[PDB]
Structures are given as C-alpha cells and as structure tokens.
CSV table of C-alpha atoms in Angstrom, one decimal:
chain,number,residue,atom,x,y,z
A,1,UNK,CA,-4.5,44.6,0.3
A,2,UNK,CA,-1.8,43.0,-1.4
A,3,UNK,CA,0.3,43.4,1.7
A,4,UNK,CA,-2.6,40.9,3.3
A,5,UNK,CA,-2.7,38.9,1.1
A,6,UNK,CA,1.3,37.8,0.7
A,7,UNK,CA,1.3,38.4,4.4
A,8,UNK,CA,-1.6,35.8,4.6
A,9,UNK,CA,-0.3,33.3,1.9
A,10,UNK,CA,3.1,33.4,4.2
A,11,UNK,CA,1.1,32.3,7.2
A,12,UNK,CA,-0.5,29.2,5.5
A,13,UNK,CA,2.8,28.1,3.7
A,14,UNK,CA,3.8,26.8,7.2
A,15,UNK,CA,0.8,25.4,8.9
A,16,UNK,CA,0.9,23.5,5.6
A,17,UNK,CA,4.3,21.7,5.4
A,18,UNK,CA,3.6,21.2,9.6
A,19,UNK,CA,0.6,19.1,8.3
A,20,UNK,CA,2.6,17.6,5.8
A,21,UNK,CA,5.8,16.6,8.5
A,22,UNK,CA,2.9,14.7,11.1
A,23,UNK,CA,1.7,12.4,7.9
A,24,UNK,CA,2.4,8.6,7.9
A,25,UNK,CA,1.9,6.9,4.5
A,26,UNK,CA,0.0,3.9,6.2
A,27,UNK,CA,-1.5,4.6,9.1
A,28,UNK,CA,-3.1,7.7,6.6
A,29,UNK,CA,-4.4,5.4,4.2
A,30,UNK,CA,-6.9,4.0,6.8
A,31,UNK,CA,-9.5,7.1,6.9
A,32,UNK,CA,-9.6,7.1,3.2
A,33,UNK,CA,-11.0,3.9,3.5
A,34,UNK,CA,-13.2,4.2,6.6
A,35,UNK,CA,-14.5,7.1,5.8
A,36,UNK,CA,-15.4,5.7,1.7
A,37,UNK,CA,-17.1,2.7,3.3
A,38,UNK,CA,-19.5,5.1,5.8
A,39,UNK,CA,-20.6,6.9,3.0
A,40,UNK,CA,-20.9,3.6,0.5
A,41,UNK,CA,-23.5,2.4,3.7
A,42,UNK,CA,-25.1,6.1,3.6
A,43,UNK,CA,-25.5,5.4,-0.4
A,44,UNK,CA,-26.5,2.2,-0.1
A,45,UNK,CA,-29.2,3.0,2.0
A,46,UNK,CA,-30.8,5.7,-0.2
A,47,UNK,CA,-31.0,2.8,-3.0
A,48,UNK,CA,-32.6,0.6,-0.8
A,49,UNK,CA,-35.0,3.3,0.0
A,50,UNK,CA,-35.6,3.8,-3.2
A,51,UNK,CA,-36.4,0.0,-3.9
A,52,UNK,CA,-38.6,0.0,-0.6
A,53,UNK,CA,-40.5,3.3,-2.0
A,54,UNK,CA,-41.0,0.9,-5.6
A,55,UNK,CA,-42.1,-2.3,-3.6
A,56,UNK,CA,-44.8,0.0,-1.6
A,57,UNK,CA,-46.6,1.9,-4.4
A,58,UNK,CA,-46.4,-1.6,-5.8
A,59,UNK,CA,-49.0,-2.3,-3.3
A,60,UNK,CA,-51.4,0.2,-4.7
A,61,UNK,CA,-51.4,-1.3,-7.8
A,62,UNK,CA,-51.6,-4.7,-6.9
A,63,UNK,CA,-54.5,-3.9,-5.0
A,64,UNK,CA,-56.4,-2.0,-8.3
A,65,UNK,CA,-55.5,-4.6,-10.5
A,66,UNK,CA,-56.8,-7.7,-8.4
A,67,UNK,CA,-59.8,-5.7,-7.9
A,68,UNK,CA,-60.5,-4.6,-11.2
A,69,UNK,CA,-62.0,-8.2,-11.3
A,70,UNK,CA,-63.6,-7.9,-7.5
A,71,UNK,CA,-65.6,-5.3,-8.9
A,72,UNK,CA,-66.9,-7.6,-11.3
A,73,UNK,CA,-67.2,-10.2,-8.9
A,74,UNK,CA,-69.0,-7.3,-7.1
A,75,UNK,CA,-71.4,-6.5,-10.3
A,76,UNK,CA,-72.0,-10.4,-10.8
A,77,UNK,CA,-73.2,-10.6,-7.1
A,78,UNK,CA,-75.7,-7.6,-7.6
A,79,UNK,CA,-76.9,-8.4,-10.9
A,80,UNK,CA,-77.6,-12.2,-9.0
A,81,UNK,CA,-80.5,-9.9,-7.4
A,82,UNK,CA,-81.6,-8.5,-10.7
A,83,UNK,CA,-80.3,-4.9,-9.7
A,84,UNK,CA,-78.8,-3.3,-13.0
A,85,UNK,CA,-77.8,0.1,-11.1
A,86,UNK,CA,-75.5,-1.5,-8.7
A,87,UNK,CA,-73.9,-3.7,-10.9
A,88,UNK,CA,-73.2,-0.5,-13.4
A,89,UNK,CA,-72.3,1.5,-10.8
A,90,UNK,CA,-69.8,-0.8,-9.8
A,91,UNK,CA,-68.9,-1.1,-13.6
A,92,UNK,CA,-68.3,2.8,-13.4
A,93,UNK,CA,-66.0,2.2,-10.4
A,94,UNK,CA,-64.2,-0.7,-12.0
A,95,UNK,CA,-63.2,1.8,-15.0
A,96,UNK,CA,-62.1,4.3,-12.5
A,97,UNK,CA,-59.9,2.2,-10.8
A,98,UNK,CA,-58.5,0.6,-13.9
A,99,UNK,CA,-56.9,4.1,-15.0
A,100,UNK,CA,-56.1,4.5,-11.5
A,101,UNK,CA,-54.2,0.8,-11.7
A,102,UNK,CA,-52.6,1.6,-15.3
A,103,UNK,CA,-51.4,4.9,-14.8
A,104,UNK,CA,-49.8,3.0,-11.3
A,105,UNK,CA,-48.7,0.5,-13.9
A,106,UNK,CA,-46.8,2.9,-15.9
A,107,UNK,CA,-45.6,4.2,-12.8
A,108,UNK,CA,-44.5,1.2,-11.8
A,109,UNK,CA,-42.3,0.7,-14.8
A,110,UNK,CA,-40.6,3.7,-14.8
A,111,UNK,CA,-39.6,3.3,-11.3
A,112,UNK,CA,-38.3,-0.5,-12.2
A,113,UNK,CA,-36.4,1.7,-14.8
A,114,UNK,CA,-35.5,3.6,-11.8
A,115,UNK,CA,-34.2,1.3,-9.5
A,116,UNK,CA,-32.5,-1.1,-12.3
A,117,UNK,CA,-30.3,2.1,-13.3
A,118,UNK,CA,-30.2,2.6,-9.6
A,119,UNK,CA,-29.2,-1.1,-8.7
A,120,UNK,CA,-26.3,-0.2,-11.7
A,121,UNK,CA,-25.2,2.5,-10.2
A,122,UNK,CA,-24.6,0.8,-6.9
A,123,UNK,CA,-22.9,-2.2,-8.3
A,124,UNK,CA,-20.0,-0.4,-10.2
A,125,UNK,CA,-19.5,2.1,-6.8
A,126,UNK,CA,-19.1,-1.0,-4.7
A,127,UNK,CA,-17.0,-2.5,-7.2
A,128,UNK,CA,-14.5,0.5,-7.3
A,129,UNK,CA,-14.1,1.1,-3.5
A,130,UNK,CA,-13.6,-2.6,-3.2
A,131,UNK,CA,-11.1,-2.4,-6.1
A,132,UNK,CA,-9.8,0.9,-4.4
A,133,UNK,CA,-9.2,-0.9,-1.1
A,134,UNK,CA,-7.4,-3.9,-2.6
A,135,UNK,CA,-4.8,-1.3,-4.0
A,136,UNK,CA,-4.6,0.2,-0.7
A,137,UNK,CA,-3.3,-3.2,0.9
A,138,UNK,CA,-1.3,-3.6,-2.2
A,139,UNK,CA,0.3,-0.3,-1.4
A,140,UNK,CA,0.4,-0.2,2.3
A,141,UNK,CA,2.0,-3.4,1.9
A,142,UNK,CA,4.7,-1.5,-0.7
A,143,UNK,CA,5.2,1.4,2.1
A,144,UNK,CA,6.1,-0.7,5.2
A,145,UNK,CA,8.5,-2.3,2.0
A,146,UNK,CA,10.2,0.9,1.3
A,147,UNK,CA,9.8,2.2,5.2
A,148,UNK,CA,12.9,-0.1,6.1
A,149,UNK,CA,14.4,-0.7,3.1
A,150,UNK,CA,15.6,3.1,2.9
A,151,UNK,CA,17.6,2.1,6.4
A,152,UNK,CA,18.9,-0.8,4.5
A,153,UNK,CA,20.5,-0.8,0.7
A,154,UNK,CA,23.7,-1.8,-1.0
A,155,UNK,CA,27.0,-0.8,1.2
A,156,UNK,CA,28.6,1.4,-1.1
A,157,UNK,CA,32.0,2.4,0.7
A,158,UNK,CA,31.4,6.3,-0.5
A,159,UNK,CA,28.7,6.9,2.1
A,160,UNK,CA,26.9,6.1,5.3
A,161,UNK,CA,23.7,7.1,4.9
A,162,UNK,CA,22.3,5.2,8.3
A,163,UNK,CA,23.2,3.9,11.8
A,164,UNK,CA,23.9,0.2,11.4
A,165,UNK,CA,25.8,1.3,8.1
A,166,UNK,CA,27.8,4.0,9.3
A,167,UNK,CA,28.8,2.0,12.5
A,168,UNK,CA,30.4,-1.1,9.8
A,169,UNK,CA,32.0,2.0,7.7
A,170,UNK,CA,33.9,3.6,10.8
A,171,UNK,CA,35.3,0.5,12.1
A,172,UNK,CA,35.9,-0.4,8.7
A,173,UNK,CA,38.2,2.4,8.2
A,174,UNK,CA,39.4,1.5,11.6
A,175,UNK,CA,40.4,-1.7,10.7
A,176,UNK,CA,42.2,-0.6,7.5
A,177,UNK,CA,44.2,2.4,9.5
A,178,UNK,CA,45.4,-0.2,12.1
A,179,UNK,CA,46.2,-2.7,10.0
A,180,UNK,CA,48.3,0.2,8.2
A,181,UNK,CA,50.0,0.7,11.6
A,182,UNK,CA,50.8,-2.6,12.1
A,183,UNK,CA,53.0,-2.6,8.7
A,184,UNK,CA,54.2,0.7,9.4
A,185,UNK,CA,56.3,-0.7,12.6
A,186,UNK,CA,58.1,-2.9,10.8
A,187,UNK,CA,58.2,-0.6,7.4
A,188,UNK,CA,59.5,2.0,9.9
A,189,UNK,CA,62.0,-0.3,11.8
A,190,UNK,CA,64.7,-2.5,9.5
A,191,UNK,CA,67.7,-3.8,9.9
A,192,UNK,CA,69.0,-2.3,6.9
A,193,UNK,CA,67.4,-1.1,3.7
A,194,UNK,CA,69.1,-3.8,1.2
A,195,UNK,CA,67.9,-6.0,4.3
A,196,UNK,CA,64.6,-4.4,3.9
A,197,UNK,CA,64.6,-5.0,-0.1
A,198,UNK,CA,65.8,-8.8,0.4
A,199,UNK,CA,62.7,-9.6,3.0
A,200,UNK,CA,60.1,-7.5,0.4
A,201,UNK,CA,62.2,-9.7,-2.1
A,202,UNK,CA,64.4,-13.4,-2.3
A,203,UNK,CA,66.4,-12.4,-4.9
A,204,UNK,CA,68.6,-14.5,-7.3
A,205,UNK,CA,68.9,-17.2,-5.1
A,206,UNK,CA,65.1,-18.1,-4.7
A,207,UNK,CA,64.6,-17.3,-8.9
A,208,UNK,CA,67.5,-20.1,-9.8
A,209,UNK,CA,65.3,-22.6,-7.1
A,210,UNK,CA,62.6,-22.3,-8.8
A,211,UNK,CA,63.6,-22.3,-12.0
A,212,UNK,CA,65.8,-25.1,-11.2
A,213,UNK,CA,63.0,-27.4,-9.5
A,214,UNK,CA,60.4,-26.5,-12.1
B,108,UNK,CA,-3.4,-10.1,-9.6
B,109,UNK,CA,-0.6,-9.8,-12.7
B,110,UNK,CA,0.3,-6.2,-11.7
B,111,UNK,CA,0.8,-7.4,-7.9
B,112,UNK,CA,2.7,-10.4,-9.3
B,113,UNK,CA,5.0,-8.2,-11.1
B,114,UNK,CA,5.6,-6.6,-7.6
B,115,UNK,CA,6.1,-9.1,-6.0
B,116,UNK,CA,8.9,-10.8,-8.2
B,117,UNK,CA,10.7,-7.4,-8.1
B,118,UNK,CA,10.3,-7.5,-4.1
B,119,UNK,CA,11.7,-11.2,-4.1
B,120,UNK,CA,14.9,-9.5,-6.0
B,121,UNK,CA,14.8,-6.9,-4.0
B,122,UNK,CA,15.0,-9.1,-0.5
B,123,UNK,CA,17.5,-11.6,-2.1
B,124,UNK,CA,19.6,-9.0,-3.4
B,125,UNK,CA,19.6,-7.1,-0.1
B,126,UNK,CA,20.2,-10.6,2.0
B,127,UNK,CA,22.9,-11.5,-0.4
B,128,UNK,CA,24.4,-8.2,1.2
B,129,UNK,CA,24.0,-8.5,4.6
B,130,UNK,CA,25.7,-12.1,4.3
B,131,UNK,CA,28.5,-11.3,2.3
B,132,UNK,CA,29.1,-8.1,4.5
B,133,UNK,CA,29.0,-10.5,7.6
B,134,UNK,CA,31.5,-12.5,6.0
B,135,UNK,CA,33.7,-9.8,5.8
B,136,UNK,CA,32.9,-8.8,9.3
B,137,UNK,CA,34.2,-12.2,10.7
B,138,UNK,CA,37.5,-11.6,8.2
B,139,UNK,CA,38.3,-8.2,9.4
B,140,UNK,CA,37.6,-9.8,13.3
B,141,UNK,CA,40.1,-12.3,12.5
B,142,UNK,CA,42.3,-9.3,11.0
B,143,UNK,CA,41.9,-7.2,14.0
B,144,UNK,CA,42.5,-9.9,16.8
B,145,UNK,CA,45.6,-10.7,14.7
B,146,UNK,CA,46.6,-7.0,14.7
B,147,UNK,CA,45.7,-6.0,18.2
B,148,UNK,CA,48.5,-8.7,19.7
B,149,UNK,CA,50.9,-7.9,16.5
B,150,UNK,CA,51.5,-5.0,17.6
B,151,UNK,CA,52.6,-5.9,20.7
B,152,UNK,CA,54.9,-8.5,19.2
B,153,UNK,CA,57.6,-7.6,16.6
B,154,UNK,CA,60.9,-7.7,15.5
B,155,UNK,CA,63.6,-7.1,18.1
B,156,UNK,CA,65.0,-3.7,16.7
B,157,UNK,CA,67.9,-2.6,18.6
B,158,UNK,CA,67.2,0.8,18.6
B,159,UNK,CA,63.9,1.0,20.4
B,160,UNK,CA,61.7,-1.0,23.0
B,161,UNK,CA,57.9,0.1,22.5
C-alpha cells in the first residue's frame, strides 16, 4: 500500500539524518581507509595465488622438457645393449611427452599473459588507494583546518556567532555605553549653557591666538 | 604536491590573516582596559555641581 510505503519512507527519513548528526569528518575517514587496505591484502593475495599456481604447473613442464632429452639419454643407454625395441619404445614415449611438454608450454605462456595483465592490474589498484590515502591526509588535515577556524573568523561588529567572540562584543558594547555615561554626567550637569558652549568651544579669544602666533 | 602547495599558501593567508586579527583585537582590548579603568574612577570624580552630590 501506498499508505506503507510513505508511512515507511517517513520512518527511514529519521534514522537517516540520526546517522548523519553522530558523523565526524576525520575520525570517519579512517575505516575508508582500513577497510580499502584489508581488501587490497585480500586482492593481493589472489594475485599471488595466481603467480604460485603459474610457478607450479611450471614444474610439469620443466620436468617434460629436460626429459625429452633423458629419454634419449634413456634410448642411447639401451641401444648401448643393441636392444632396438627399448630404445623405440622410449622414442614413442619421448614423443608423448614432448606434446605433453608443448601443449604445457603454450599453457605456460598464456598464463605469463595471465599473470603480466594480472601483475598490471595490481600495480595501478595499489597506486590509487595509495594516491587515495594521500588525499585523505591532505583532507583530514583541511577538516581539523576548518574544525576551529569556524569558531574563529574576522570580528565583524554585526554578529557574534561564537563564545570567545560574543564575550569581546558584549563588553564591547559595555564599554561604549559606559563611556556614554561618563559624558552624559557632565553633558547633563553645566554651569550654564553659554558656559557649556565655551568649554565645547574657546571662542574668539583662542581663534585671534592662534592666528596671531601662527 | 602543486595542488597541496596551492593549499597550503591559502592556509598560510588564512592563519596570518586570522592572527593579524586576534593581535589587533588584543590591542584594542588593552585600549578599551585603559578606557574602562579611566571611566570606572571618572565617574566617581567630576565637576562640583551645586545642585547635586552623586
């Protein structure tokens, strides 16, 4: 029902954003990493698997093609009797094992084909999560940047915006209203307002001094 | 190593603009001090008004 469904899309929307809340830009970062190394070492060891697998049936073929000359070492050391039978016989075998040695031959190519596009492979995956991890230092290192540097910015007079900054603000304004007070006393109090006018300014008598002097 | 030395130059301008800051705002810390310490006993002290004692 479509009921369900919005009712169930509702749910999620919330056990979502709590998941988002309980993230931390750094300390996240780390599982991407650990996590992307455990399964480079899982990867890693497939390809040396392979490359073990290569270097065994190697062995087969070794063995063939070192004894395709045994067995004529083998026929030389019957014929040294004067036996023809056991020598061809062993001439018959030799042949055997030769297709047996070049079709492991062939074999053995392919999987060198194999295990070069394999040993490829690996290189450029260990390049990019070693790559990928020197951005994540570059960028952890940009977070714990940004982390404190949103408590601390210019101290633009139309805001607050933190705790050290909206401490300096108040008392700021503190010290501009009491400083406002203290003129206000005597602005308030005056002996007379002409008096008050002739203490804001000298007059005629302080104009002719210093044009006088000057 | 060019991309992180491009971030890093604009995080030395960032630090130096942001210590400029705090020292120029501590220098008008100590000035408003001064002002307040000169207020707080001003106040206090003032002309001798006939009309009132405060």
């Amino acid at each position: 029902m479509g009921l369900f469904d919005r009712i169930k899309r509702v749910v999620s929307s919330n056990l979502n954003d709590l998941v988002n809340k309980a993230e931390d830009p750094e300390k996240m970062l780390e599982q991407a990493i650990l996590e992307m190394q455990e399964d480079l070492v899982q990867l890693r060891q497939g390809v040396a698997q392979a490359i073990a697998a290569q270097k065994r049936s190697e062995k087969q073929y070794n063995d063939a093609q070192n004894e395709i000359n045994k067995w004529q070492r083998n026929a030389q050391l019957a014929l040294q009797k004067g036996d023809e039978n056991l020598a061809r016989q062993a001439l018959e075998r030799k042949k055997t094992y030769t297709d047996t040695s070049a079709a492991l031959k062939a074999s053995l190519d392919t999987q060198s084909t194999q295990v070069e596009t394999l040993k490829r492979n690996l290189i450029q995956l260990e390049s990019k999560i070693s790559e990928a991890k020197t951005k994540k230092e570059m960028l952890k290192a940009r977070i714990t940047t940004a982390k404190a540097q949103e408590q601390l910015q210019g101290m633009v007079r139309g805001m607050n915006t933190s705790s050290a900054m909206s401490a300096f603000e108040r008392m700021e304004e503190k010290v501009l209203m009491q400083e406002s007070r203290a003129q206000a006393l005597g602005e308030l109090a005056g002996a007379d307002l002409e008096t008050q006018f002739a203490q804001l300014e000298g007059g005629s008598d302080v104009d002719d001094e210093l044009a006088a002097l000057k």
